[PDB]
């Protein structure tokens, strides 16, 4: 995949499974245009988001839906999404893995960019 998203639940120490993910790309008119979406697999991973051809250069936002992921803990999180914005592919082709370690009031995210 040119783009993969991996989400871990840092509270329970498990992949975050069946979590909805929306990807957007910044359009000419400065709006976020929907790009790809899905739900995480059993390994916390969302593969098959885009194709080489479709994954053009631009600014991308990854939105991971957390609103009620935390419901069973009794905690309302800091925001309904965990969001990460990255600027893509200005030097040839790159594949991107956006990895996110999520808690209700904190998250760590790393973009791994390979060629």
Is 9 near its own copies (CB under 8 A)? yes
DSSP characters over 27-68? -TTS-EEEEEEEE--TTSEE-----TTT--SEEEEEEEE-TT
The Cα–Cα gap between 53 and 66 comes to 30
Q: Residues 38 to 67: which contact Zn ion by CB under 5 A?
A: 47, 63, 65
Those residues whose C-beta lies under 8 Å from the C-beta of residue 42, and which sit 6 or more positions away, are: 15, 17
Q: Residues 12 to 31: which contact Zn ion by CB under 5 A?
A: 22
Is 45 near its own copies (CB under 8 A)? no
Q: Give me 111's structure tokens.
A: 């973009």
Answer yes or no: are the C-beta atoms of 10 and 102 closer than 8 Å. yes
Question: How far apart are CB 45 and its own copies at their closest, in Å?
Answer: 12
Is 59 near its own copies (CB under 8 A)? yes
Q: Residues 86 to 115: which contact Zn ion by CB under 5 A?
A: none
Is 5 near its own copies (CB under 8 A)? no
Question: How far apart are CB 38 and its own copies at their closest, in Å?
Answer: 20
Q: Residue positions in the annotated binding site?
A: 6, 45, 108
Q: Which residues bind Zn ion (CB under 5 A)?
A: 1, 4, 22, 47, 63, 65, 81, 85
């Amino acid at each position: 995949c040119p783009l993969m998203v991996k989400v871990l639940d840092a509270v329970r120490g498990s992949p975050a499974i069946n979590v909805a993910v929306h990807v957007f790309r910044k359009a000419a008119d400065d709006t976020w245009e929907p790009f790809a979406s899905g739900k995480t697999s059993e390994s916390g991973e969302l593969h098959g988001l885009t194709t080489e051809e479709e994954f053009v250069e631009g600014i991308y936002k990854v939105e991971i839906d957390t609103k009620s992921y935390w419901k069973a803990l009794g905690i309302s999180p800091m925001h309904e999404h965990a969001e990460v914005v990255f600027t893509a592919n200005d030097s040839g082709p790159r594949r991107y893995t956006i990895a996110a370690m999520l808690s209700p009031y904190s998250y760590s995210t790393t973009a791994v960019v390979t060629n």
